[PDB]
Structure 1
Amino acid sequence: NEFQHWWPPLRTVILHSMGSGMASDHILITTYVGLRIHSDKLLKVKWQYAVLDEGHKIRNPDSEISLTCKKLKTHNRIILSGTPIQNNLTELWSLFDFIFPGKLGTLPVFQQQFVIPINIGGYANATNIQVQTGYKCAVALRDLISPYLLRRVKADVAKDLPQKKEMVLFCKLTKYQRSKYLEFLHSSDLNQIQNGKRNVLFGIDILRKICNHPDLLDRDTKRHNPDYGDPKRSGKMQVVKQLLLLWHKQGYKALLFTQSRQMLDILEEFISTKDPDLSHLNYLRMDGTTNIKGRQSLVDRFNNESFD
């Protein structure tokens, strides 16, 4: 749309269900999954000006998308990452390697050296091993990369951004929840990690399920569905009810962010039927299985919703 609006003469095309393309003359747009699918000559075209939109999708060096993009080497490769580093500096290494392979060291040099934590000398001032004085080394790398990155803060031109609130609420674990938590903690240690596998790495999932939906802590929820969920087993549900009722009486359009869709459905059932107080509030639903057209329709409804 932007291509045909600002610059009609440009020959741009969609590599989703197109044809001709390389057979004809200039610009090509594709999907990352489409790029994976077209591992044919397409990778050998040597697109003079290569630009990737969702750089955040190639953060992982081992991800197939990032490596597939990497094989397509061109004299000018660019990334338009939606966000900078979020998880690890190896992501920045991968991005820079895609755009600037020879200007930065290999994976080892980076990890053993170019790592803000103790690897680079998080105590570079010979202070406590804690990473508090790790400067003049990571700062040097930041200054080296600055001549290769651009960033405009919304406040730079978009000062019209009302106040944000980092209001971290706090809840209390119920006696039932506390008992189950302690039981799991005592019984968690089988190999003490069992390579995670529902003990530490995904025992975190068990802990989260206890915290949120102890009432329906099972895959076979249908057996308990007639009598559960029960908010009495989770004070977080009580806090949610209080806030939702307050915002409904205050007429505020509220957004609720949830974990795996099981919790989503449990909350939906709670609000809809379990508590008549919340049943009075009209609500909307969304999930990862929602249709794209339905997703857009629901977004439009929310932007101008009569719901709560």
Structure 2
Amino acid sequence: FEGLGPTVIVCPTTVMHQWVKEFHTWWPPFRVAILHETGSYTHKKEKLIRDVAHCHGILITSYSYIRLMQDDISRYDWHYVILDEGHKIRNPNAAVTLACKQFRTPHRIILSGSPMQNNLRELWSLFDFIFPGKLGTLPVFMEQFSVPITMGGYSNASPVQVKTAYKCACVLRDTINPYLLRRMK
């Protein structure tokens, strides 16, 4: 492709209006279309999607819409998938997670100020989206990373177990650094 191709952004419905404003106050040339029941065409939605794909513009979609049409959006060769509040795909077995992961674009970005909230399964789901290979399949990740670190956090493990938790955390901390920019206030 020449330049920036068609880009899809998935954000919570309370965030779409803010996103469309920022594009209009930081780069006017970008054409931004929002997929919603209200919409802006008062007609069939497929049309808008097709138009966006054609003009190589920017399409903003609610999370529930990606679940509803998983076989329609993914076939139009999108160039970038940006997820605002990306922790919405934190559960690997959730249908929203399955729909989000169907994009074939190598470039996929998650915007989540709290990536992990509950466990390393939460982290693996997000990292399986941006980089499927980096952390392996969940059974290997569950056994080799999460179990040794969640067992060493208790203040009752044998001194070998705590050192295992440190080593597993150290290996996990530096296999995600280039793919996680985490800056606190």
Q: Distance in 2 between matches of 1:48 and 1:56?
A: 21
Equivalent residue of 1:28, what SS? strand
Q: Tell me which residue corresponds to 2:108.
A: 77
Question: Is this contact kept in 2: 1:85–1:91, CA < 8 A?
Answer: yes
How does 1:142-221 map onto structure 2 within 5 Å?
142-154=173-185
2:132 pairs with 1:104? no
Alignment equivalent of 2:148, drawn from 91, 110, 118: 118
Deviation at 1:70?
0.7
Q: Which amino acid aligns with 1:22?
A: R
In the TM superposition, what are the counterparts of 1:256-271 in structure 2 within 5 Å? none
Verify: 1:95 aligned to 2:130, yes or no: no
1:166 counterpart residue number: none
Aligned AA for 1:31?
Answer: S
CA distance in 2, matches of 1:98, 1:139: 22
CA distance in structure 2 between the aligned counterparts of 1:151 and 1:96, rounded to whole angstroms: 14
Change (3 A) 1:18 1:110: farther
**Structural mapping, 1:219-258, within 5 Å:** none
User: Would you tell me which structure has more strand in proportion to its own residues?
Assistant: 2
> Are positions 1:33 and 2:59 aligned together?
no
Q: Secondary structure at the match of 1:42?
A: helix
* Partner Cα separation in structure 1 for residue 179 and residue 141 of structure 2: 17
Unaligned runs of 5+ in 1: 155-308
Secondary structure class of the residue paired with 1:135 = helix
How far 1:66 moved relative to its partner?
Answer: 1.0
Do structure 1's residue 42 and structure 2's residue 42 form an aligned pair?
no
Percent identity reads 55
TM-score by length of 2: 0.73
Determine the C-alpha separation between the residues in 2 that align with 1:120 and 1:29.
Answer: 38
**Matches of 2:149 and 2:159 in 1, distance apart?**
11
Q: In 1, Cα distance between the equivalents of 2:40 and 2:108?
A: 24
Counterpart in the other structure of 1:22? 50
The reply to whether residue 128 of structure 1 matches residue 161 of structure 2 is no
| 1:3, distance to aligned residue in structure 2 (A) | 0.2
Match in the other structure for 2:45: none
User: C-alpha displacement at 1:68, in angstroms?
Assistant: 0.7
Q: Is contact 2:91–2:122 with CA below 8 Å preserved after alignment? A: yes
Q: How many residues are paired up?
A: 150
Q: Hey, which of these two has a bigger chunk of helix by percent?
A: 2
Cα deviation, 1:169-198, whole Å, max 9, x if unaligned, reads xxxxxxxxxxxxxxxxxxxxxxxxxxxxxx
Name the counterpart of 1:3: 23
Secondary structure of the 1:82 match is coil
Any idea what the Cα deviations from partners look like across 1:266-291, whole Å, max 9, x if unmatched? xxxxxxxxxxxxxxxxxxxxxxxxxx
Q: 1:78, 1:99 within 8 Å by CA — same for their partners in 2?
A: yes
2:168 alignment partner, one of 118, 123, 137: 137
Distance in structure 1 (CA, Å) of the matches to 2:151 and 2:119? 16
SS at match of 1:137: helix
Aligned pair 1:12/2:32, yes or no? yes
Counterparts of 1:23 and 1:84, CA distance in 2: 33
When Rg is computed on C-alpha atoms for both structures, the one with the higher figure is 1
- Aligned-pair Cα RMSD in Å: 2.3
* SS of equivalent residue, structure 1 residue 52: strand
- Normalised to the residue count of structure 1, the TM-score between the two structures is 0.45
